[PDB]
Amino acid sequence: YVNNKELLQAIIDWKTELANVRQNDTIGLAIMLIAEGLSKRFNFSG
DNA sequence: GGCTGCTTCAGTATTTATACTCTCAGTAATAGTGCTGAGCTCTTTA
User: How far is the CA of A12 from the CAs of A6, A9, A17, A30, in angstroms?
Assistant: First the structure.
């Protein structure tokens, strides 16, 4: 799906900003992505 | 620049497998609750 590392980056960055409102959606798109990919796991998707 | 053929779609005729951890929360059942009366307790003296 998606490089875990870049996600660490984005979230570190929203950490730093929340240390000041919203967050980037890059990480949010990736979240949708990973949710939907897990959905196709084998116990579920049944 | 208005102009005809393809086109795509739309309308007919039972019974679903694997958290965890508090942690709280406020609730509904539930025993604590105290009456009423009354029924027996009891004695009285006429």
Answer: 10, 5, 9, 15
Report CA(A11)–C1'(B43) in Å, whole number: 95
What is the spatial distance between Cα A29 and Cα A32, in angstroms, rounded to a whole number? 5
In strand B, the nucleotides that come within 7 Å of a protein beta carbon are 17-18
Are the C-beta atoms of A28 and A14 separated by less than 8 Å? no
Cβ–Cβ under 8 Å, residues A33 and A2: yes
Residue located via tokens 């409102």: A21
Between residue 15 and residue 44 of chain A, the positions with Cβ below 7 Å from nucleic chain B are 43-44
